């Protein structure tokens, strides 16, 4: 029971700190995972 009495809740955290970590998490997962393949297009367009 004491293992959980701490409970370290996220919902109580101040908004600005939570937003600052949310940007980090979003960048880490979503944007980073997103895959864009533009190298072929860019090289072809430059070569033309």
């Amino acid at each position: 029971v004491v293992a959980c009495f701490r409970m370290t809740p996220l919902y109580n955290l101040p908004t600005h700190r939570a937003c600052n970590m949310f940007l980090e998490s979003y960048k880490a997962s979503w944007i980073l995972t997103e895959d864009h393949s533009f190298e072929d297009r860019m090289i072809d367009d430059l070569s033309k």
């Binding site: 029971v1 004491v2 293992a3 009495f5 701490r6």
Partner: protein, 93 residues
């Protein structure tokens, strides 16, 4: 009348006595708290197996980050343990 005062003063006697013998006379250090709990509860505590569990529980219980358990923090935790014991009573069936 003053029965809650009696319970509270008994609490004070016990945890201060368990603090003084082992370390700083008043507060609750890690070793103080470990031996204290050993003295306090038997047949119910699961912390007996590892003193490192006592250490980490102390670390959390010291959100103030001083390594010493404040009296208010300790009493609120043992109130949560009263909560757990009442839940035990209801779970009994």
């Amino acid at each position: 009348g003053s029965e809650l005062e009696s319970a509270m003063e008994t609490l004070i006697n016990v945890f201060h006595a368990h603090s003084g013998k082992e370390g700083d006379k008043y507060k609750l250090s890690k070793k103080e708290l470990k031996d204290l709990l050993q003295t306090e509860l038997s047949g119910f505590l699961d912390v007996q197996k590892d003193a490192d569990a006592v250490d980490k529980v102390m670390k959390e219980l010291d959100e103030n980050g001083d390594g010493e358990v404040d009296f208010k923090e300790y009493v609120v935790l043992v109130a949560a343990l009263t909560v757990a014991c009442n839940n035990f009573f209801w779970e009994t069936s």
